[PDB]
Amino acid sequence: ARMYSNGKGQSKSVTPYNLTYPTYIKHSKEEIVDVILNLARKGTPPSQIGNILRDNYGVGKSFAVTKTKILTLLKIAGLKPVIPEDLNNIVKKCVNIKAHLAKYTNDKSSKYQLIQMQSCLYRVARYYKSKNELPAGWKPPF
């Protein structure tokens, strides 16, 4: 089940059985690889890179053509971010809640949501600072 609440949803998307090569498409390998690195330098998250490749350029799951994963390609090109993108999105939501509570101090429901959010940050931090993906003395922006 869900980690912070009583949810038991089941909405996911199916991974294919085999992957082949997308011969119906209208670009070369080298063009697709160029499209990714452009979208990266403009500052898009890698989950959004995937959405665009599927929706506009017509490639499912973005790996059948490249034999390599999106984040690994960005490390080969040297475009790696300073913080992993998951930990980064958790710090953003915390900041937002603290900026709301700063002006609407009375909101007990928002107070409740903040302590849940903050717990999740530290649990994710401890993962990354074991795999050597963050400096040992990293601390939140707060």
Binding site: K12, V14, Y24, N51, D55, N56, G60
Partner: protein, 81 residues
């Protein structure tokens, strides 16, 4: 074993949820849509998360919705993958 249990009928396949089967099934597919008038062909995904406009003429060809996306009234398509 029973034939019914090892080899379900195609009727049974279509009634089940996409995950609750002996082998899980892909539901999304790719299509080539052709624009009314300009007759240019665009590759699109069913279930699109983005609205899409025809190359050249800039008519909105496909509208994103909560489920399967909606082709504009005059346009037509073929499944490619």
């Amino acid at each position: 074993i029973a034939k019914n249990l090892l080899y379900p009928t195609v009727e049974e396949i279509k009634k089940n949820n996409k995950r609750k089967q002996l082998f899980q099934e892909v539901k999304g597919y790719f299509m080539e849509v052709k624009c009314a008038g300009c007759a240019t062909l665009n590759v699109c995904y069913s279930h699109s998360q983005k609205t899409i406009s025809c190359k050249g003429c800039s008519m909105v060809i496909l509208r994103s919705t909560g489920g399967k996306a909606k082709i504009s009234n005059e346009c037509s398509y073929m499944v490619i993958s």
